[PDB]
Amino acid sequence: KFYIQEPPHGSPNWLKVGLTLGTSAFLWIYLIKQHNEDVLEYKRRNGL
Amino acid sequence: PFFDVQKKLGVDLDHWMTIQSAEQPHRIPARCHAFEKEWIECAHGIGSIRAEK
Amino acid sequence: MSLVYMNIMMAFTVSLTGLLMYRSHLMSSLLCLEGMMLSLFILATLMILNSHFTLASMMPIILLVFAACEAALGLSLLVMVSNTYG
Amino acid sequence: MNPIILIIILMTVMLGTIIVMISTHWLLIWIGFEMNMLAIIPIMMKKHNPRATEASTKYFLTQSTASMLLMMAIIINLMFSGQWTVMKLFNPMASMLMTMALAMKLGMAPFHFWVPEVTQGIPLSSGLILLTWQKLAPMSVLYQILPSINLDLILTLSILSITIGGWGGLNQTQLRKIMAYSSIAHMGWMTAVLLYNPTMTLLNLIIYIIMTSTMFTLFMANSTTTTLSLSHTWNKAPIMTILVLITLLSMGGLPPLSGFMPKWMIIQEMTKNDSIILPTLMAITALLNLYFYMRLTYSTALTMFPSTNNMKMKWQFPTTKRMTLLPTMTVLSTMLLPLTPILSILE
Amino acid sequence: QKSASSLLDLIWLETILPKTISLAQMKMSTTITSQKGLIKLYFLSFLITILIST
Amino acid sequence: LQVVRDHWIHVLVPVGFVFGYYLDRKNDEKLAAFRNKSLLYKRELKPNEEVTW
Amino acid sequence: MLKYIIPTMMLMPLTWLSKNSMIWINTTLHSLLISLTSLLLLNQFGDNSLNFSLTFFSDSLSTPLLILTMWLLPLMLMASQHHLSKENLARKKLFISMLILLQLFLIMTFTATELIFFYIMFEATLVPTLIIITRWGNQTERLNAGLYFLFYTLAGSLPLLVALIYIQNTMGSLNFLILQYWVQPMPNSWSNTFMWLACMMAFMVKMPLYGLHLWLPKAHVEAPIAGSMVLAAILLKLGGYGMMRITLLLNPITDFMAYPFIMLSLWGMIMTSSICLRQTDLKSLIAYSSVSHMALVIVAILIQTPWSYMGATALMIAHGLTSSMLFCLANSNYERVHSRTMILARGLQTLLPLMAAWWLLASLTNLALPPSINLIGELFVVMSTFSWSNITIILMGLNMVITALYSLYMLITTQRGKHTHHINNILPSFTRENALMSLHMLPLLLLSLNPKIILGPLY
Amino acid sequence: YEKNPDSHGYDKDPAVDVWNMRVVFFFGFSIVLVLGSTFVAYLPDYRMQEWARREAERLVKYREAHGLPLMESNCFDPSKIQLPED
Amino acid sequence: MMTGRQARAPLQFLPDEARSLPPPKLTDPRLAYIGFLGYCSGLIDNAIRRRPVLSAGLHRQFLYITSFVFVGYYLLKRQDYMYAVRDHDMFSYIKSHPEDFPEKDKKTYREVFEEFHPVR
Amino acid sequence: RWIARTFFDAPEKNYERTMAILQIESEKAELRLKELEVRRLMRAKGDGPWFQYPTIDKALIDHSPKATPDN
C-alpha cells in the first residue's frame, strides 16, 4: 500500500496549517475585541 | 443594485456631460439653458414622485 | 419632432424588420444592424447640434467607435462561422 | 488561449459590469454593455469546436442588437424633455423600448429564443458566466429606471416568461437547456416583483446566483451533459448527485429548502397589495416546473431497477479536479430558509 | 366501487391525457427556426400591438 | 465522574433535556411581564419574596 | 417545548457517531427516555391552553397527538430492524437519521403556534417520509408512487399558503392565539367560496375523503413498515389536526359549503368500507380501513358539536395505535412468507399459537369493542352525527355492520381454517414481535381506563 | 431466507441480543408503562373538573340557602348591556 | 424604497449612527446556527474529498465555523440597524400626520351587534 | 404534591405568560397594519422617507456669469 509515492495531500503540510491557525487566532480574537468595544461605546451612547 | 462610488470617493466621472447646465468648454449657453435651471431648481431636493406633480 | 426625425425612425425600423424577418444570409443581418447603427449616429448628431448642447457632442464620436470594434468582432465571428461549412 | 489573457479578459468583464452599476450617465451604461459583449465573446468559444462558434454568434447578434435598441430608447429620451442621467425616463415610449431592450439583454418571453441554444453550445464555465454574472447588469439598470416602467409590459413579460420558459424543458434530457429554461422562470419572478418591492428582486437574484452556482459547479465535479450522465455518476459516487438533485429542488422552490424563500416572500409582498389571482397563476406553473424536476428525481433510487450501470468505472484514484467554492454555496443554498430575518440586510 | 375508482383514475387519466396532449402544448412547437423566431417577431410586434392597445 | 468516558456515548441526550429545559427556564425571564399585574392574581409581595415565580 | 426539541436533535449525532452493532441499542434507549418526558408534557388544565414560548404552544389535542408521536418513534425504529439487518453502516445511520428528522418536523408541526410555521414545517414533514418509502420501499416497479404522490399533495396543497398570507395581511397576526379573539364572521359569497374551499380541500387531501382516496393504497403498499407506521398512524392526523384548528374561522361558511363534502364522506365511508371487504393482499385492507375511519373523522370535523370533537380526537389516537399495530402484524406475517397476498397462507392458530392473541386483540380493537377507545371515539361521533341528522344512522350503523364484517374477516383466513403445508419455513414468533405488539395494545387497553387524557380540548 | 439457526434467539445477530431485550423490555415495559401509567394514573386534577365539583357544591348550597334561583341563564346581566334599534 | 435615506452617504456599510443600537450578544441563536452551517459546510467538503469525515476537521472545521460566525455576525448587526431605521421612519411619519391616520376610540362590546348563526 | 411542585408550573406562571405573549404579538399585529397603511399612503403622497427617487442634483448648475447675450 502506497509504494507508489506520497500523494501530496497524504502527508501533512505544517506551514499551511500554521497559517490557517493564524487566521483562526487573528479572526476570532478580532471578533471578540470588536464585540467588547461596540458594547462599550453602546454603553456610552446611553447612561446608567 | 446601482452603487454610488463617485460621490463616495469624491470624484466626478460622468457628472460633467450629465445635463445642459454644466460648465461648458468655453461657456456657451445651451438653447434651453435657463429652463433647465428652473426645472432643476424646482425638482432639486424632492423625490421625483411629487416632483412630477 | 419636426419631420426628419419621423423619417430617420422609419429608416431605423426598416433596418430592424429587415434584421428579424430575414435569416437567409448572415452578412445581410449583420449589415442591417450596422445601417440601423448609422441611423442612430445621425439622430444623436442632429439633436445635439440642434439644441446647441456642446459638451455632449462626443455621443456621435464615441457612439460611432463602438459601431466598429464591435462590428469588426461581428465579421470575425462571421468568418469563423463560415469556415465551419462554406 | 493564454492563462494571463483570460485574467485580462475576465477582469474586463467584471470591469464592464461594474461600470454599468456605477455610472449615472446613459452613454456610459451603454458602453458597459458593449464591453461585456466584446469581452464575453472570447470566454465562450474557449475550446474551438464549431458548436461554441455558432452558439456564440447567436448570442452576439441578439445581444448586440439589444444594445442598439437600448441606445435608440436613450436617444428618444433625449428627444423628449431630456438630459443625460440615470433616473425616471420622461417618455412612456422610451420606457417601452427600454423594457424590451433589457428584456433581450436577459432572457424573457418574446426574446428568450436564444438562451437554451447558446447555453448548450458553449462549455460549462462559459455557461456559469452567462447565466449569472451578465444577469447582474440589466437588473441593476431596471432597479434604477423602474419609476417610468409601464406596469402592463413588465408584468406581462414576467408571466409569459414563467408560462412559456417554465413550461419548456419537458422533453429535454440535456442539462444546459434545463438550466436555461429555469433561468427564464426565475427571471419571470424577479421581473414580476420588480415594480412592487425591488428588494425582493435583488433577493431572488442573489439566491438564484447561488443556485446556478452550485448547480454548474457540481456539473464540473461530475462532468455531465445529460441525465443519463447523472445516473451513471450515481453509480460512480452518490454524494455529488444528491447535491445536484437537492439543489434542483431548491431550484423548484420546495418549502423546507431555501429556494422556497424567494417564492414565499414574493407571495407576501405580492399579495399584500390588491391582486391575489396572479400569484396563484404563477404558483401553478411553479408546480409544473416542480414535478418535471421530480421526474428528474425519479432518475435515481437505490436497489435500483436496471439503469445499465456498466463498468471499468470503479476507480482507485480520487480526482484532483479543483472545485472552487462548492461546500459553502451548497449548504448555503440548502439551509438558508431558517434565516431571512436577514432579508433586509440585502437592501 | 370499480365504477367510482375507474372513473377516478379515468379522470386522473383525463388529466394525464391532458398531460399527454398537454405535451402537445409543448409539442405545439414545430422546432423550426422560421417558426418561433419570425412568429415571435410578428407576435412580438403584436406585443407592441397589444401594448399599443392594452 | 471521569469513567463516563467508557459510557461517553450515552450521556449526550440527558444533557440535551437538561440543556433545553434550562433554556426554557431562562426564556421565561425574557417573557417575564405582568408578574403581579394581572387582574385575577394580585398579591402583596411576601416578606421573603420579591417575585411570585 | 424546546426541552423536547433539543434531545432528539442531540439524538441525531448519537446515531451518526457510534460503534457498529450498538446503533439500535443507543437509539431505542434514548428515544424511550424521550418518551418519558413526552409523558411529562401533560400539565394541561382549566381553560387557557398552556403556552411554553411565544413561538409555539400546546392545547390539549396537540398534547395527545404529540405524546403519540414521541411514543411512536422507539416502537417504529424498534420494528424497522430485520427488515434489513444487513447493509453498510451508512444505510442504517441514514435511515435512523431520517426517522429522527421526520419526528423533529412532526413535533414542530403539532406544537406550532403560527400557521405559516405550521405550513413550512408541514411540507418539511412530507419530504423525509418520501425519502423513506421511495429510497427503499421494496419497490414493486416502484410505481413512482412517492413522487407524483408528493404531487397529489402539492397539486392543490400549495394555494392554502396563498389564502393564508391573505389572512395575514388583512388581519395582521397569524398567531393562533390572537387569530382567536379577533376572528370575525365571513358571509357566504363567491370569494369566501374559493377561500373556504381552498383551505378545506387543501387539508382534505391528507385525510383521504372518498373522492381522493386513491392516494393511500399504493403509497401504503410500497412503504417499508417504518414508513407505514409513520404514514397512516400520523400523516393523516396532520391533515385532520390542521383542519381542527383552521376551522376556527369560516364560521357560517362551513354550513352551506360543508354539506356536499359531508354527503361525500357519509357515502364514501360505506363505499370504502365495502371495497376493503373483498380485496386480496392484506396490506391494503388495513389501508382502506384507515380511509374509512378518516372519512368518519371528516364527518366529525365539519359538524361543529363539541361531542363531534371529543369522539373525533379519540378516534385519531385510537385509530393511530390500532391501524399502526395491525400494519405491524401484516409485516410480521410478511417476513415469514414473502407474499403480501392474504389468501396465500392460512392457519397460524395451530402455528404461532401466541400470535393469535395479538391478531384477535388488535382486530377486536378495530372491531369497535365497547371499552376500547376506538368505540369511545366512534361512539361519540355517531352521537354527534345523529344529532345533526336523525336519518344518517342508517349509513353510520351500516358502517358498523360492514366494519364488523371485514374487521373480523381479516381475523380469519390469514389466521384460521388450515395450514397450507407447502410452507415449511415460518419460524416461531420472536421476542421482538411480542415486544412490538405489547407496546401497541397494552397502552391502548390502559387508555380504556382513564380516557380523559385523550378526549379533546372541549371537555 | 436468512432466518436464524436459532441459537437461542432474538432481535439481532448474537451476543448483543440479551442486552437488546434488556433495554427494550426494561425501558419500554418497566419505566414508561408502569411508571408513566402511575404518573398519568393520578396526576394533578386534570382539566380542573375536581375543582369544578367542589366549587359546584359550594355555589349550589349558597344558591339554595339564600333563596336565589340557581342557574339564571342570561350569561351576562341585561342590567348592563345595550341593544341596536330599528 | 429607503434609497433616499441611505443615498445621502453612499456605500456606508453601517453608519456612525448605528452604534447606538445594542449589538447581538454572543450565543445569539442566529449566528450560532450560522456556526452549525459552517459545520455542515466543512462536513460536505470532507465528503467531496473522499477522506472519511471527522478527519482533517481539526483546523478546517474551525476555519469554516469561525468564518461564518464572523461574516454572519456583521450581517446581523447591519440587519438590526435596518429594522431600526425602518421602525423610526414609521413612527416619525405617524406623529407628523394627524389627518392621514385617524385615532378612533374603540367602543366596547356593550355596543356590538352580530348574526352568529348557531349550529342548528 | 410531589408531582405538582417538582414537575409543573402554577396556573399563575402559564396564565400571565399568555398575558405577555398576547401583549407582544398583539402590538405586533397592530403595528403591521400601521406599516401597511403607511407604505400604502407613501406612493400617493411621496412625503416621507421611504419612497424617494433622486432627481438630478442642483449641485452643479454652473451659476457662473456666461456669454452675455441672454440666459
PDB file of C-alpha atoms in Angstrom, chain C residues 4-77:
ATOM      1  CA  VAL C   4     -36.535  64.331 -40.349  1.00  0.00           C
ATOM      2  CA  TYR C   5     -36.894  62.548 -37.015  1.00  0.00           C
ATOM      3  CA  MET C   6     -40.008  60.719 -38.222  1.00  0.00           C
ATOM      4  CA  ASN C   7     -38.227  59.679 -41.402  1.00  0.00           C
ATOM      5  CA  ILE C   8     -34.996  58.521 -39.759  1.00  0.00           C
ATOM      6  CA  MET C   9     -37.067  56.471 -37.328  1.00  0.00           C
ATOM      7  CA  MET C  10     -38.808  54.806 -40.257  1.00  0.00           C
ATOM      8  CA  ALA C  11     -35.361  54.006 -41.653  1.00  0.00           C
ATOM      9  CA  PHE C  12     -34.417  52.553 -38.259  1.00  0.00           C
ATOM     10  CA  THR C  13     -37.448  50.268 -38.251  1.00  0.00           C
ATOM     11  CA  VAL C  14     -36.918  49.259 -41.878  1.00  0.00           C
ATOM     12  CA  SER C  15     -33.463  48.095 -40.831  1.00  0.00           C
ATOM     13  CA  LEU C  16     -34.851  46.319 -37.772  1.00  0.00           C
ATOM     14  CA  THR C  17     -37.650  44.450 -39.536  1.00  0.00           C
ATOM     15  CA  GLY C  18     -35.079  43.607 -42.184  1.00  0.00           C
ATOM     16  CA  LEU C  19     -32.977  42.196 -39.363  1.00  0.00           C
ATOM     17  CA  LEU C  20     -35.602  39.958 -37.788  1.00  0.00           C
ATOM     18  CA  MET C  21     -37.587  38.812 -40.834  1.00  0.00           C
ATOM     19  CA  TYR C  22     -34.635  37.646 -42.974  1.00  0.00           C
ATOM     20  CA  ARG C  23     -32.327  34.931 -41.634  1.00  0.00           C
ATOM     21  CA  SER C  24     -31.149  33.738 -45.067  1.00  0.00           C
ATOM     22  CA  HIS C  25     -27.769  35.455 -45.374  1.00  0.00           C
ATOM     23  CA  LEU C  26     -25.930  36.284 -42.177  1.00  0.00           C
ATOM     24  CA  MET C  27     -23.891  39.125 -43.674  1.00  0.00           C
ATOM     25  CA  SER C  28     -27.230  40.721 -44.534  1.00  0.00           C
ATOM     26  CA  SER C  29     -28.349  40.525 -40.900  1.00  0.00           C
ATOM     27  CA  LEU C  30     -25.109  41.982 -39.585  1.00  0.00           C
ATOM     28  CA  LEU C  31     -25.329  44.672 -42.241  1.00  0.00           C
ATOM     29  CA  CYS C  32     -28.904  45.755 -41.453  1.00  0.00           C
ATOM     30  CA  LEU C  33     -27.842  46.036 -37.833  1.00  0.00           C
ATOM     31  CA  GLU C  34     -24.966  48.272 -38.870  1.00  0.00           C
ATOM     32  CA  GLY C  35     -27.128  50.534 -41.024  1.00  0.00           C
ATOM     33  CA  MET C  36     -29.516  50.987 -38.117  1.00  0.00           C
ATOM     34  CA  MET C  37     -26.448  51.922 -36.066  1.00  0.00           C
ATOM     35  CA  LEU C  38     -25.658  54.623 -38.624  1.00  0.00           C
ATOM     36  CA  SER C  39     -29.187  55.959 -38.239  1.00  0.00           C
ATOM     37  CA  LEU C  40     -28.537  56.335 -34.516  1.00  0.00           C
ATOM     38  CA  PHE C  41     -25.374  58.297 -35.267  1.00  0.00           C
ATOM     39  CA  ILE C  42     -27.474  60.621 -37.418  1.00  0.00           C
ATOM     40  CA  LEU C  43     -30.142  61.078 -34.740  1.00  0.00           C
ATOM     41  CA  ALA C  44     -27.767  61.953 -31.907  1.00  0.00           C
ATOM     42  CA  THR C  45     -25.902  64.337 -34.189  1.00  0.00           C
ATOM     43  CA  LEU C  46     -28.957  66.194 -35.465  1.00  0.00           C
ATOM     44  CA  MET C  47     -30.408  66.533 -31.990  1.00  0.00           C
ATOM     45  CA  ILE C  48     -27.322  67.584 -30.055  1.00  0.00           C
ATOM     46  CA  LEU C  49     -26.379  70.063 -32.770  1.00  0.00           C
ATOM     47  CA  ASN C  50     -29.976  71.289 -32.880  1.00  0.00           C
ATOM     48  CA  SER C  51     -30.077  72.203 -29.195  1.00  0.00           C
ATOM     49  CA  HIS C  52     -26.530  73.644 -29.258  1.00  0.00           C
ATOM     50  CA  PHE C  53     -25.600  71.405 -26.344  1.00  0.00           C
ATOM     51  CA  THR C  54     -21.893  71.366 -26.980  1.00  0.00           C
ATOM     52  CA  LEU C  55     -20.177  69.409 -24.217  1.00  0.00           C
ATOM     53  CA  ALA C  56     -22.107  66.294 -25.243  1.00  0.00           C
ATOM     54  CA  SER C  57     -21.025  66.348 -28.884  1.00  0.00           C
ATOM     55  CA  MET C  58     -18.995  63.198 -28.220  1.00  0.00           C
ATOM     56  CA  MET C  59     -22.039  60.947 -28.481  1.00  0.00           C
ATOM     57  CA  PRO C  60     -21.623  60.795 -32.276  1.00  0.00           C
ATOM     58  CA  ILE C  61     -17.891  60.034 -31.968  1.00  0.00           C
ATOM     59  CA  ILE C  62     -17.905  57.602 -29.052  1.00  0.00           C
ATOM     60  CA  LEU C  63     -21.188  56.152 -30.280  1.00  0.00           C
ATOM     61  CA  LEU C  64     -19.510  55.607 -33.651  1.00  0.00           C
ATOM     62  CA  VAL C  65     -16.340  53.995 -32.315  1.00  0.00           C
ATOM     63  CA  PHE C  66     -18.321  51.080 -30.929  1.00  0.00           C
ATOM     64  CA  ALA C  67     -20.054  50.884 -34.266  1.00  0.00           C
ATOM     65  CA  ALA C  68     -16.783  49.311 -35.365  1.00  0.00           C
ATOM     66  CA  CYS C  69     -14.692  47.485 -32.762  1.00  0.00           C
ATOM     67  CA  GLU C  70     -17.946  45.652 -32.086  1.00  0.00           C
ATOM     68  CA  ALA C  71     -18.753  45.307 -35.793  1.00  0.00           C
ATOM     69  CA  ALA C  72     -15.247  44.063 -36.588  1.00  0.00           C
ATOM     70  CA  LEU C  73     -15.871  41.459 -33.912  1.00  0.00           C
ATOM     71  CA  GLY C  74     -19.055  40.651 -35.796  1.00  0.00           C
ATOM     72  CA  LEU C  75     -17.292  39.964 -39.072  1.00  0.00           C
ATOM     73  CA  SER C  76     -14.576  37.903 -37.400  1.00  0.00           C
ATOM     74  CA  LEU C  77     -17.246  35.661 -35.919  1.00  0.00           C
TER      75      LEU C  77
END
